[PDB]
Amino acid sequence: VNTALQEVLKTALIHDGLARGIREAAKALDKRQAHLCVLASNCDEPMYVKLVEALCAEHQINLIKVDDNKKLGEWVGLCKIDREGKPRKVVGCSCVVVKDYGKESQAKDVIEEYFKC
């Protein structure tokens, strides 16, 4: 669920196993070293939505939908300025391709059985 996504993004942040952005994320997806994929839908996407769905609909690739770019951008740790409470300005990240090495969590297991269901 969303707190499981928050935990796996924090684990990827502290273990540096993450590919933020879109260009190196597409590099990682065409590199075939991918485990999970996320997307914030209903944004200003005239064609990026169909590009990213035809990209993520290849093989072994999962999906998690977020309401806006501002929330997963906070979970990935993109822009952290003035961290004493609320941040100053956080820019939204579109998609995240994540490598998982420290896969020891109950949240990982419940999100994995959410993908498999």
Partner: protein
């Protein structure tokens, strides 16, 4: 120091709007199409791509320039 000779400028680099979405072509069917070329070297397996010039195709870092 302002001298009577004209002053040169550093190269400003022109900003492209969503170039990666121009490489992969998405039609109405379940297929993915590659417009420009790919990379054949052992350093970059399938990741980076080549330039679409009018008389050659230039690699990003491997310098495999193939001219027609």
């Amino acid at each position: 120091k302002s001298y009577t000779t004209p002053k040169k400028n550093k190269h400003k680099r022109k900003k492209v709007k969503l170039a990666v979405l121009k490489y992969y072509k998405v039609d109405e069917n379940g297929k993915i199409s590659r417009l420009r070329r790919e990379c054949p070297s052992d350093e970059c397996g399938a990741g980076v791509f080549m330039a679409s010039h009018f008389d050659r195709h230039y690699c990003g870092k491997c310098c495999l320039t193939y001219c027609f």
